[PDB]
Each structure stands twice: as structure tokens, then as C-alpha cells.
Subunit: 158 residues, 3 copies
Amino acid sequence: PVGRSLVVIVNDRTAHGDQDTSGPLVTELLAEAGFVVDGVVVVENDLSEIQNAVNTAVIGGVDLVVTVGGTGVTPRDVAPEATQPLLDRELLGIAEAIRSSGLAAGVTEAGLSRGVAGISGSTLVVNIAGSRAAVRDGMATLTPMAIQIIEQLSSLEI
Amino acid sequence: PVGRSLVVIVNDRTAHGDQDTSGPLVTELLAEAGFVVDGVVVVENDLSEIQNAVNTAVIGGVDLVVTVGGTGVTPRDVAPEATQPLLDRELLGIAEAIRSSGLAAGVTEAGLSRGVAGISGSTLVVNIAGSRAAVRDGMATLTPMAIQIIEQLSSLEI
Amino acid sequence: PVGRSLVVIVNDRTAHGDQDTSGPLVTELLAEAGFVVDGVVVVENDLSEIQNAVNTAVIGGVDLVVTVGGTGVTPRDVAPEATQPLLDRELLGIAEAIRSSGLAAGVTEAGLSRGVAGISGSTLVVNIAGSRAAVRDGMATLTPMAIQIIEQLSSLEI
């Protein structure tokens, strides 16, 4: 196994009982890249809830947290605002590659995603947009990068 | 019509009577994408003038403001410095896509543009470099993105 | 000659006597693009040493400083943290183009580089990752951009 992962669904409707159509796809793509999926957390578009969810993964030593949702242009979308202050160092390369690949694939919500990416504690944290198309394209870009970052951290033999 | 737009020409020479060769091209490309062009404002490379021009569009409820000029490497180029503090949220995807497309087209002043992009109030604000080549390539990248952001805002039915 | 350049090797091992395998390649690529190479400085992954090295080039009026190393994900990698506060204006276009080209070439440490770029005083400063592959790909992207920025500054006839 490459490492442990957690998925955070950032969606007001999912947090009140609607069918989450994105999370299972993220889970299966993580598993197919070789990650153990420790769990899925659903939160509202709420800064402190999102922070609590990520910080909980960070304190439990999770290797990869993928948040899904809350990267659009409306004031309610606060995943990036919630994430950025938790980052000890940003990895613009991840966020830029996700936007760039989504734009080339014609997935607008991915090209325009305000998502950030970085290391918090021992955890790689990456925001992706909420749609199935964004999760598909974002995950294809992200997972080899995440494998390399995580493999590099454990080859430090720290 | 997709929405209302304003063009802000940021150019010391144009502000003192020289022929503006970029503004008419921006106007015609906006019109061809379906925007009403409310007007054109000419300002110097001057932070408070640029801010006044943009804030005036913001308070009038304009949907898209394209600023043209003042994104180069010299100290006089202050469009990005003027713009960034007005943004309630940045849209790095727009600025990155404009740079990336300009670089692939060999338009140096576009690849290297310090331009930013984001939402201020109800207005999408985007900096592009001053040349005809930069306006051509920047507008081709920008206008479908702007249509999608604006169509999304009005489909909120707010 | 296009201008004067300095190379700063940011590497703990090189700073204690190991063979620097990257610096000669950077020197030869600079020379081949037409820069005079004023010198090479070796420093540790140490914020104040890196700053001293860059600020020394800035005060001596150097046109281009390329730093090599210290852009990875581990806490010891501090080239970007050292560089960013010295920049009077950032040139995201350079850093983004370096990441983007490295990603397309399959050079992971380049796609993921946290390197920044910008103008400090009269000096263009650009961080690249430490490997030979990163220096090869980064330099191919950087040197035409650097020539254009420097040629533009001296054509100001300031």
C-alpha cells in the first residue's frame, strides 16, 4: 500500500441527506492507485467544519486528504479559505496542474477551481471541485504526484 | 446579451492623447462574444486612478471589467497591485490560463503578464497585457470563462 | 553579451564538500545563451545564507541569479521562503512555465518545484530544482524569458 487517505466531501446538500455521487468515485480511484481509504467525512460549506475535518486527519497521521467541493466562485464555497491557513507549505504545482489539465479537458469547474494544495503536518492536502468530471480529471493528475510525494517522505526513513 | 462590460485602458501615453490601438479591439471582441460594452475608461499607470476606475464599475454593477496594460516588469506597471486588494476572491485559473496560452502562442508580454483576476462585488475583473497580440490571445482565453462565470451567477437567480 | 549572471547552489552536501553535479551544467547553459557567468556561490539550506548570497548579487548589479536546489517538500528546503521576501515584484509566469514544462517532460521535482521568480533591485531571480533533469528543462524554459526581460530593461535606456 502507498499510504493512508481520507476523503472530505464539502457539500451543504450532502451534509443534509442528499445522495453523494462524487465520494464513491474518489474512494475507488484512491483504492485503485494503491491507497487505503480510512474513511469519508461529509461537511457543510463552513470554514470551521472543513478545518476540523482536515485537522482531524492531520492529527491522525493520514498521508493524503482529498477534499471535494467548495472551490467555485460563490461566497458559500470556502474550501480554499479553510485549507490555506492549515498549510505549512503550499504546493502550487499540484493546484496549477489540476487547473491546467481540467481546462485542456473542457471541465470548466476544474479549470476555474480555486482549490489549493500543500503539506499540513505529515499530510498532503488537495482541494478538488465537486463534480464527477472534476474528480475524474483531478484524480488522474493528482494521484501520481501524491504517490511521489508520499514515497519520497517515507524514503527519508524519518 | 450575456452581460455588461467595461474596458479600462491603463496607459500613460493614451491618458495624454496618444492613439489607443488596443481598446477598439477589446470592445469589438467583447461585443462579438455577446457583451454590451458600457464604455471605455482611460487611466494612467497610477494605483488610485486604476482603483477608482474599477471600483466605479463595481458600484455600477458591471459584470465584466477587462483592464488592458500595466502588467509588465517596470515599476510604473501597477495594474496588478491596484487590482489585487479589490478582489473578494481571486480566480487564479483565469490569470494562469491567460499566461499559459500567451506563452504557447509566443506572445511574451502575455506569458510574462503579472495580471491577476477575480470577483469584486458582483464584477469579474481581469488584467491583460497592453499589446494587440496580448489582447487577441487573452480575450480568446478569457471570454468563454467569463461567459461561464457570469451565466452561473445569474442562474443562481439571486 | 546579454548580461551578467550568478549561480547560487543551494545544497547542504555541496556546502560540506560533495561533488556539485548541477552547477557546471547551469554555467554552461548560461554561457551558451550569451550571459557572462560572474561566479558560483554554494550555500546550505539556510534562509539567511541564501538571502545573503542573493542580496550580494543584487547589490553588485547582477542581471540574472539562478538558484538551484531547495525547492522540494521537506522542511529543510527553504529557497522559496528565502527568495520571496526579497522580491519587489513576482513573475509568476516564469515559475508557472517552469513547473508546467517540467511536468510535461515527466521531471517530477520540476513539476512540483516550490520555486518562485521575480525582480529584486535590478536583478531577475529564479529558483529551480536541484537535479540535472530539472536544470536542463528549467533552463530551456527560463533563458529566453530572461533574455527578453533583461533586453527590455536595457532598452528602457535607464
